[PDB]
Amino acid sequence: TCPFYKKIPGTGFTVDAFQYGVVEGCTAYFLTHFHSDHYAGLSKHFTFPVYCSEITGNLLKNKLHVQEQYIHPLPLDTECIVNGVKVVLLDANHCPGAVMILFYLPNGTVILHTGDFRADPSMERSLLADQKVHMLYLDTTYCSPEYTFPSQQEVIRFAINTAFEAVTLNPHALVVCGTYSIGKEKVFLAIADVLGSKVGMSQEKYKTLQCLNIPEINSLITTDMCSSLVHLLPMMQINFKGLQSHLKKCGGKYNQILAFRPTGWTHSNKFTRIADVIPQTKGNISIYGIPYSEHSSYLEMKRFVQWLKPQKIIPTVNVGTWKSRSTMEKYFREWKLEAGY
Numbered sequence: 001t002c003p004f005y006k007k008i009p010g011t012g013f014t015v016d017a018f019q020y021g022v023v024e025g026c027t028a029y030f031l032t033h034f035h036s037d038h039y040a041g042l043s044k045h046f047t048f049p050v051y052c053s054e055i056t057g058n059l060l061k062n063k064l065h066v067q068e069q070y071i072h073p074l075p076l077d078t079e080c081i082v083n084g085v086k087v088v089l090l091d092a093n094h095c096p097g098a099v100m101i102l103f104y105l106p107n108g109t110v111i112l113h114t115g116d117f118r119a120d121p122s123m124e125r126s127l128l129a130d131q132k133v134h135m136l137y138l139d140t141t142y143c144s145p146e147y148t149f150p151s152q153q154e155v156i157r158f159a160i161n162t163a164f165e166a167v168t169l170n171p172h173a174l175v176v177c178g179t180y181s182i183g184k185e186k187v188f189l190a191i192a193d194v195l196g197s198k199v200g201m202s203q204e205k206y207k208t209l210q211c212l213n214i215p216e217i218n219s220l221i222t223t224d225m226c227s228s229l230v231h232l233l234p235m236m237q238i239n240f241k242g243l244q245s246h247l248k249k250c251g252g253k254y255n256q257i258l259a260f261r262p263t264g265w266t267h268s269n270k271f272t273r274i275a276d277v278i279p280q281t282k283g284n285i286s287i288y289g290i291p292y293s294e295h296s297s298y299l300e301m302k303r304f305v306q307w308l309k310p311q312k313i314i315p316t317v318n319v320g321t322w323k324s325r326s327t328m329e330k331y332f333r334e335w336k337l338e339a340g341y
């Protein structure tokens with residue numbers, strides 16, 4: 001059955017709760033973003049109203065084949081009424097079309113659901129600042145002090161300079177970027193832009209990108225792999241064997257590969273700076289691991305919560321074991337005692 005952390009008290013709403021069949025009492029199902037864990041269970045067979053951003057609706061329509069009659073896209077940063085209740089969608093700074101939802105309950109309680117998010121100080125000058133928020137449903141993916149990472153911009157700068165140097169030294173090098181869902185598109189778009197190239201990719205991946213309301217998209221991407229010097233492949237193929245194999249498929253048009261694996265955190269965040277990063281190499285193939293995160297670091301999460309001063313926090317990630325919940329509760333109490341709320 002649908003957990004309490006996916007229910008919004010004193011409405012018939014749920015959030016990211018598509019895997020439990022019909023939820024008793026639910027009149028509107030919200031979807032924060034198009035990642036499979038959050039959409040799990042949605043298909044052409046779903047017949048209840050879904051509320052989401054415009055980008056998330058394009059994906060539902062075109063990739064999942066959800067029938068149009070059940071898709072209710074809402075604009076961002078706009079007060080809207082849904083089944084008699086005031087709501088606002090805000091940019092979550094996660095993947096394309098990802099939202100946080102602000103719910104103004106009839107009794108005067110205010111609830112923020114973050115969805116998946118990467119907390120940023122620009123969120124401190126949104127509609128959130130206009131009133132008190134009583135309850136917070138929080139993306140706790142990286143809620144532990146070891147989880148540090150560079151800014152998105154530091155990582156992109158490094159990627160840009162690395163790629164530019166490699167292709168200027170060898171104009172027959174190919175650049176490959178690994179991918180498994182939406183998100184982290186700036187990695188491959190910024191590399192292509194510095195090399196004067198479109199990004200080449202499979203038909204399924206191109207169809208995904210065509211849904212994302214990216215300006216001038218037709219000038220940036222193509223299905224003609226031949227004509228392009230940056231290619232996208234599934235993350236699982238980003239290894240020496242997969243990459244040599246791909247290089248044989250391209251028709252001797254390239255004689256070297258430089259590949260990037262955008263990952264989350266892995267244990268080597270605790271020493272290395274981005275400027276120290278060096279690749280793994282075997283022969284004419286090099287692979288760089290780059291920690292481009294679309295989740296809050298510990299420090300970004302803590303700052304956001306200490307600013308917001310919620311009366312209660314409800315975790316949405318790592319809630320499956322008592323040890324994790326206990327550890328998280330400890331950090332929330334520290335934050336509260338330091339900041340005086």
Ligand code: NI
Nearest residue numbers: 033035094116
């Ligand atoms: Ni996500």
